[PDB]
Amino acid sequence: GDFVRNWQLVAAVPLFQKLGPAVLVEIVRALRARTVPAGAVICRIGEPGDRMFFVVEGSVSVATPNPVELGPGAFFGEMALISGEPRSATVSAATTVSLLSLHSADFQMLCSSSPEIAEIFRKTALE
Amino acid sequence: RRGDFVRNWQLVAAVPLFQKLGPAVLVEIVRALRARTVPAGAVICRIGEPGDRMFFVVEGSVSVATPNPVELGPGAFFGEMALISGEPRSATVSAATTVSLLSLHSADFQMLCSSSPEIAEIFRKTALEAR
Ligand SMILES: [K+]
Ligand SMILES: [K+]
Ligand SMILES: [K+]
Ligand SMILES: [K+]
Prior knowledge:
Chain A is α+β, with helices and mostly antiparallel strands. Helices cover 33% and strands 28% of the residues of chain A.
C-alpha cells in the first residue's frame, strides 16, 4: 500500500535506473516520512544538502530564477546524493505537504555494503 | 525486471498466510519464488503425493480436482499445507489453460523462518484456523 506507492515513487528517479529490486527495497525502507506546513522552508539555497525528497501529497515551491511548483510524484535534491554541492535553491511547502526523505548517509552506506552497487552508482551518475 | 517484482510482491502480500509481516520479510519470500509455466492440461500436483511447495497463480487458470472441481485464476494460491505438515496433496491440481506460476519450496521457506520465527507462527496459525 504505502510500500508499492513508495516503490513506484523511488523507481521514477534516474539515478536509481540500473539498481536491482533488492536495492530499491533498501532505498524504500530508508525513506523517512515528513509533513510540512504550508509556507515552511524545506531547504535554503546555499546550505549543504544531506538528503533528497519525494513529494507524496501537496505542493512544494522551488525558488529557482523562475519559480516552479512541484507536486505529488516530484522529487528534488538529487544532487545531495551524487555531489557534496549545496542546495541549488530554496524550497518551501507551497501548500501543506507530505514528503518522503532519503538521507545521503543512508545511500552512502548502501553503496558501502556492496562493491557491485558502488560501481553502478558511479556509472549512473552523469547527466 | 522491477515491474514483475512489484506484482509478485502484491500477489504474495494479498495471501492471508503472510499477515502483519513487515516488508523486510515479504521481500525475502518474493526472492525464493521460482517461476514456472504449465501447458494447458499438464498435472501440477496429484492427490496423495507428498507436497514440498505451495503455488501462486500469476496468469492463466488451474483446475483443482476437489469433491466439486474449482477453477482458480490469477491471485490464487494453493499447496500451503505442504510447508507446515507432512500430509499429502489433498487434491489434484492441473493447468486449465496455459498457466504461469510461482512456487515457494518448503526448504526455502524454512531458511526464511530460521531468520524471523514470526513467519512460521503466523503461517501455521492462519493455515489451520482456515481448515
Ligand atoms: K518563490
Ligand atoms: K480466483
Ligand atoms: K478463473
Ligand atoms: K487445494
